[PDB]
Symmetry: D2
Subunit: 455 residues, 4 copies
Amino acid sequence: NYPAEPFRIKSVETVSMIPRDERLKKMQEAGYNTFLLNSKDIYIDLLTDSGTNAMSDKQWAGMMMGDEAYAGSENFYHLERTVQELFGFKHIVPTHQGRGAENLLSQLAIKPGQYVAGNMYFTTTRYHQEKNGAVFVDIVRDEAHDAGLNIAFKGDIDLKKLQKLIDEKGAENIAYICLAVTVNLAGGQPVSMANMRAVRELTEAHGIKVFYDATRCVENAYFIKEQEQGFENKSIAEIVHEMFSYADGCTMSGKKDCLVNIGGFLCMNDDEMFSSAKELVVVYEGMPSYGGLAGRDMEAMAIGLREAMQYEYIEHRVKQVRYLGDKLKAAGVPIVEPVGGHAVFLDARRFCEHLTQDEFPAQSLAASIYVETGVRSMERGIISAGRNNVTGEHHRPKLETVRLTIPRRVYTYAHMDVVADGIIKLYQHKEDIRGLKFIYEPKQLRFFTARFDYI
Amino acid sequence: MNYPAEPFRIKSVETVSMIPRDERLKKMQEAGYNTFLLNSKDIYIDLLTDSGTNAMSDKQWAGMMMGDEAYAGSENFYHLERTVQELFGFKHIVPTHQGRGAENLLSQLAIKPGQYVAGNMYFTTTRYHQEKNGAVFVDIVRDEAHDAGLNIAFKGDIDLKKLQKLIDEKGAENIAYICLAVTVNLAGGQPVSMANMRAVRELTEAHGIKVFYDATRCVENAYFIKEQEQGFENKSIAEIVHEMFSYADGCTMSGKKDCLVNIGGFLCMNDDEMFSSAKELVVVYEGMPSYGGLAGRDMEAMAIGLREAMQYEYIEHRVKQVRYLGDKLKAAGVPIVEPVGGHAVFLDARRFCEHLTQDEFPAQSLAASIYVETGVRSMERGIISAGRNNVTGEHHRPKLETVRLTIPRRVYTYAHMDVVADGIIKLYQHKEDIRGLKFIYEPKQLRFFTARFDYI
Amino acid sequence: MNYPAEPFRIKSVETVSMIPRDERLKKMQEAGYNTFLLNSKDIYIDLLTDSGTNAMSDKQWAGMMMGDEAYAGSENFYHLERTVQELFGFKHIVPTHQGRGAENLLSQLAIKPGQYVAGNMYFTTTRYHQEKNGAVFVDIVRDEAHDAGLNIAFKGDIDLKKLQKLIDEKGAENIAYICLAVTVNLAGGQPVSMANMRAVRELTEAHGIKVFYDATRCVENAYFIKEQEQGFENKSIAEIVHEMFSYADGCTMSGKKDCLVNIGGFLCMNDDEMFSSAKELVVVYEGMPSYGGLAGRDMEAMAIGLREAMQYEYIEHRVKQVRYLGDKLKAAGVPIVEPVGGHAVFLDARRFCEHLTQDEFPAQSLAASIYVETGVRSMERGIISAGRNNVTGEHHRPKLETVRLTIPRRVYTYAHMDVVADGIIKLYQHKEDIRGLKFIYEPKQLRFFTARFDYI
Amino acid sequence: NYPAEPFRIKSVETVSMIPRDERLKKMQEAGYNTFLLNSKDIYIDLLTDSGTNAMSDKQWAGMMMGDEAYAGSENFYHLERTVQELFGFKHIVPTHQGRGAENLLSQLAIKPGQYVAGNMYFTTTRYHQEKNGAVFVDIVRDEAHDAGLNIAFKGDIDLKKLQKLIDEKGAENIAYICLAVTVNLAGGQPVSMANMRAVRELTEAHGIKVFYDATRCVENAYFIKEQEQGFENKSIAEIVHEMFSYADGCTMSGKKDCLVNIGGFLCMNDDEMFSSAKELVVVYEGMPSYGGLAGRDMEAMAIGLREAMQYEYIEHRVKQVRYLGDKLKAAGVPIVEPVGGHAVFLDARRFCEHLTQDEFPAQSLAASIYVETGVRSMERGIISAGRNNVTGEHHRPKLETVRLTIPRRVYTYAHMDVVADGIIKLYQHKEDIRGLKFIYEPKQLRFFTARFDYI
Ligand SMILES: CC1=C(O)/C(=C\N=C(/C)C(=O)O)C(COP(=O)(O)O)=CN1
Ligand SMILES: CC1=C(O)/C(=C\N=C(/C)C(=O)O)C(COP(=O)(O)O)=CN1
Ligand SMILES: CC1=C(O)/C(=C\N=C(/C)C(=O)O)C(COP(=O)(O)O)=CN1
Ligand SMILES: CC1=C(O)/C(=C\N=C(/C)C(=O)O)C(COP(=O)(O)O)=CN1
Ligand SMILES: [K+]
Ligand SMILES: [K+]
Ligand SMILES: [K+]
Ligand SMILES: [K+]
């Protein structure tokens, strides 16, 4: 049901343990915007699972063995061998993290005016597509947009929407299909092997390329192992390798499922594209053999990807997130369902139904959570959606959420209990949560530095 | 309140795994049914000891990169020295590689052949160093410390009536010193009260008798005082620690326990002449007074760790994590030493195995069976550890025949505790399957470390 | 005086070794005669670049254990931020993963298509980011910087007459900014004087033109100012650095050079609106303004390293070690760029190989031959690096056709320098054996990194 | 002649660089006793080569992999395998450093009244022999006592003295022969393979055991490679293994030739002695599988011993010391000859022949060296010999020396030049060096804390 950690603690990170009254002052000093809190003031930091993971003793040994050569580092060759074996692409180019790989892919693979279709999108990924002249098309199944619908493989592409696009626009006018595993925007929802194969088969008949956004591909493979018929005798490694067999390449943020603090990479099978990629990596990142990483980080990521293949590790990772979601759900706390691989999203609209979206319930709930528990969470609602700059109106998103994002191997079920118990107690007196109003709003990136006060 | 979450985050991890029961069976036999003789790789959760098995912090690992390895004058020595002077309040410090190295120095320096050393229950290496330097050991702990099931507070306390009697019957000049350990390891990690430390100092001082503390789990002990002794609820852990040592003439310390390191110890004293003599001796056994058989980076880690240990939330969690395991075991009717102590839960082997005699080594055997059935390693703390009476040659016979589930600091979670509890509860369902043991190889001293047995 | 000993001790080592000439020959062919394409394992002493190849200190490694990996609000970000604010004197900082990431931001933010960017000699990635954002590059370095053998001080200085002419012929509003690099890498690591920085600021300020520094080797540059510019002999390295940047509106920095790290860079500016815009852009390419595509531990290492770099003895030794190699080479009549610069000795390939034309790529070829004969890796810094004229499609033709023996900071000793000098002197004895090269594979930009050749 | 370092620098240790005037104050604050200087005030620290070595990147990787189990650590098994392969003993017991191993050996191998004979002695080694009731007998060749005699293998035992001892005392009355490699007291002098075999053969015929003090056995093996006929096609590893084939066991300080900062061990071939050793290690050190070391240090020492077998490494180590001695000798500076493996010893008696031994020329020369260069060196003369406590007279040693002891892989030839140039300049005006007199003298260990002032 919930397994014990399949690891023990080698070293600890010291935290302050400041009490509620002091947390309230820190929160006020941050203008009630959790993005403005200092890391040294936070007990449990669930802002993101990106780059916040705990490394192993074996990775730290690798950290001492950084061959820092500008070209031809042994660590690059270790990374390259590892990704070829595990993902099964012919070619790999390291990048400092995922968005560096996305910049490269989109410049290489898009002609202005072409469509890129995907199972929803991530903000950086879609931006790089659009900056290169692509029009984005959502081809996710309709269910993915229903946040209360508890169904499996909610990240699946709708083959009919793909077909429709090909019929209406023409294959030559589609740059590529961008299939993300898992689907972050839908709450971390997995994609099935059947769907990946069906997309490979249809695109292949039309000469259309498919590139994966692989950042949480290991969480994805765990869902396939757990829930997809016929994958129960298959190892995580076998699943991961089969998944990528249905792609022409990928962009990877190692900062997620490769269990590192920095690192990413671009893969492809096509020799000519690989050649062009090497011509471009040097402009933005570094050499084809470091790509904006220290040798020690290529080493840490090579070791971390291989650790991520262990079944017990990934089972525990996903079930720890599930434990938090299960406990919240059992107390009647409204969440996005089903719980995804990396986070639990509170539905702040329903949590704070005495407040209007214009009063920023997700922002305000995230502040309350920090004050009551020392937990930092991310606003993923009206604030982070930003303001229409043509009209000056808020972009008003359907999802008004607080993201409890879980770094890998950092926290225990007891820290999950701190988070849950705190949220449950807040829920019991939810009507007491107050609305927020801007007191400082920057013109851009407002979620990063906006300051608020209570209404 | 009852069970707080870890007051830290995980910075790095070590993988854990379990070999099949069939393989464990083979390994237990190959180790001659002594858990000390199993290999680390063959252990799933290793509760052999809290000694040297602690997880260090990121700050201690940063100190590890700043090892100043000079033979004399290292910054890491000065940092250790001023930290221990500040926190414990003794005048002088001599580092040693670990606690038994400091006990070697103390016993050689402070005992004349034929004298008595009186202590709140024996300890294994401690008693051996006393006895090998010609002392007779006298246990002056309260009787109640030897009754496993008796739930009373401050079980580690010295019985003043027994101390008084020793002085009367033997004369103060024939007592080398009082050895006061905090907490008391073999009583189950049981604390000593401040009132008792103060009373002991007062009695011994009037008679000119020296008192040397075994400081190895003094922070755990300070936690119990803050939690349970009336008047201390408001004092900081650090204030408690400093007051505790104000009632002593010096101490031995294994830093491998409450200083949160993997190696390290020291000897403290207030007396200038003893300091001089201790330095002459340290060079023979350990190294120059300026490193004491430690790398500079380990002095640094030990200085940093001892100060980390003073954080209330850290030590509250440390002790309550142990308590949680004991609570779950108790709830299922598993017999344990009570109350639960600072560093371990001690299964009561006499009750766990009523069908065996103490001469059939129930504790040694239970530890074997726990490993075979669960892949958890635990330690014998009974008749084998007690050693032999150095006059009659018979086994010492402790009332406490226990198996120790010892918890390294900052290493495991409550989920690991639940795994351990579950496996022990299961084994209890068939306790009568645990077989008697007999010696096949017996070392001449500290026999428990490497002795080998076979089933009767 | 002339050649000081290392002002540090060795804390840890990496082994070095040499594969036979026969094996090196094979490897050079397999790398298509481009030194960039050899493997690290196959190199004995690796002088390809001083970029990212530096040895960190014990203090920086201690900072590496204290990485605060938070996505926003990391202590390591705050430490970097206040360090750069203190030492460089700019209002705002945006970290980037390395220097070309900061050049991406600057060029996008500060250039309107069709504008001119004027600089003290081009640099490779710098010129590409200017040109790809629609700028025309204009070289305003003094003519003497392009003559390898001419031994004059402060060769990096901007020719004010050329700057003045640019403003006259093109109009100030059509100049996006002046790019002033310290030191000037491709001139041979040549410094810029304070007087010149002050004069440039004065001229540009009167016309409303912005000046952005390439800060990557500013500490080396400050060393030359202290050593050679009248009036500065008494100022600290840190004072020199802070004054230098007071003449700028912001900078790009590759921390991989003078900040003594293996990864890292940043963009600084004084202007609030530019800061806002830079943050919008950083999120697209690098990461959140609060880490900029760097682990927290690398921000920390870069903060610590930049402050280490201000120690006079450290930078005096850094530069004199380079000078020693150049001195030994000169003494034996080997043709080099003079005076020797801050980070490398640059062999003059035109003189080393008089028998070849620049169209036959003497520098690329010499670098190949050095590796084959010595197992030392060096870099082409000539016509291949210069790239193509983005209007005519012809090779840019630099007067400076050089091969760079680039010295990573705190990595090698004088004995390694002597090994390098000895091997190069030997190769010089048969310079006429070095054969012309021709392209077999040419990338569309920054071609030198991965191009492959074959002998004519 | 002098090779370049067969390594490059991975990381540096920061030092203060304080100037001459400030060094003079530090020296005065230390009462002119270099033992009292703070490490943070010293540029180049030549006090000892014990435990001061620079580790490699590979050792630091091993430092991150410490299996800290109290019993059965993987690191112990790695150490054990390595020592068995390289030294060729059947059994190994780890100890925290060399004197811990000596305590164990002497308790195991000596009955009160027995003789232990050796090629000179080391202070801790001889003390442990004597505390256990042994009488020490020097059986080194007479030449070893002539400090100006430049001959090879000066550490050799005189077989005739050994024979004489057996004849006069009886084999049953000799506990063992303690053969040290190299011989520290004679200036770091090596012992020949011929001598080790001859001693093995004579002792074997009489049933007498031989235990090596192996602390600088790798320096020793380098001398055999370099100078002993017939060892020129032999690897350092082959030499080391043959050396120990002539012993019944050894005590080792890894802090010397195993390239670590802490660590040591005891080896033996005899099963019964191994059993007894395991019974004793637990009293003083720890378990047979950690012996008073952290698991990470058993790992560092296992990796370091194997690194020490590399020919280029040990050739450079010994020749760097030689470089310093050669340069001093060429300027006419009086030194113990020939230069040993680990240090250069200045003859302070001849250096300061205007001073009497009672004026402490070695102590005073060591102070001058620090003041002029920031180099710390060790007094090895009348001060470190101590005072006769029966009579109160100085012990007056024949050797009045300053030891310039070189840690492995820490310094370069340039640092050797700082040391040499400074000493040479002092030598040029040697008559200016002033005598010292006590102002504070402890009753014991006076070299550690005595304070002086100028006469
Ligand atoms: C699905 C997906 C992501 O979730 C993603 C980054 N995620 C962040 C920063 C997060 O907080 O979820 C990126 C960008 O990776 P990067 O943050 O540049 O290494 C790409 N795809
Ligand atoms: C109270 C006390 C101890 O518990 C102790 C060692 N304890 C061990 C090894 C244990 O497992 O409890 C020692 C010896 O310390 P040492 O293991 O040598 O650092 C002294 N006193
Ligand atoms: C003056 C200057 C440089 O020298 C520079 C990079 N130099 C390299 C790679 C070199 O080998 O010189 C860069 C680019 O920095 P980067 O290599 O991207 O961190 C900018 N300016
Ligand atoms: C020949 C020899 C030595 O040189 C030695 C220690 N030497 C020191 C401390 C030195 O400064 O030379 C020891 C003692 O090793 P230890 O310092 O306890 O690891 C034994 N034999
Ligand atoms: K990070
Ligand atoms: K690097
Ligand atoms: K040391
Ligand atoms: K340990």
